[PDB]
Amino acid sequence: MASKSGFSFGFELGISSQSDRGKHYIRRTKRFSHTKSVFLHAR
């Protein structure tokens, strides 16, 4: 997210204001399961 808001006016007098906003969020998830089964009966 990025937001900007600023004011700049002349009147003598002059006034200026600027506000800067930046925000980032990131999420990752990984899950792994491996099952390997062997049965060997000989007679």
């Binding site: 600023g6 004011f7 700049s8 006016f9």
Partner: protein, 47 residues
């Protein structure tokens, strides 16, 4: 001694084989993607 005696017959050997194989394979891939944006701008002249 059982129930009977052998009146006649043949002698020799029996050979039998039963052999069985059963393979199954399954592979499955599911993929999903979502992309979204907003943008906004306001100003006049100064703001």
């Amino acid at each position: 001694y059982g129930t009977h005696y052998l009146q006649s017959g043949s002698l020799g050997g029996e050979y039998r084989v039963l052999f069985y194989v059963d393979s199954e394979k399954l592979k499955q891939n599911d993929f999903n993607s979502v992309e979204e944006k907003k943008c906004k701008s306001s100003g006049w002249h100064k703001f």
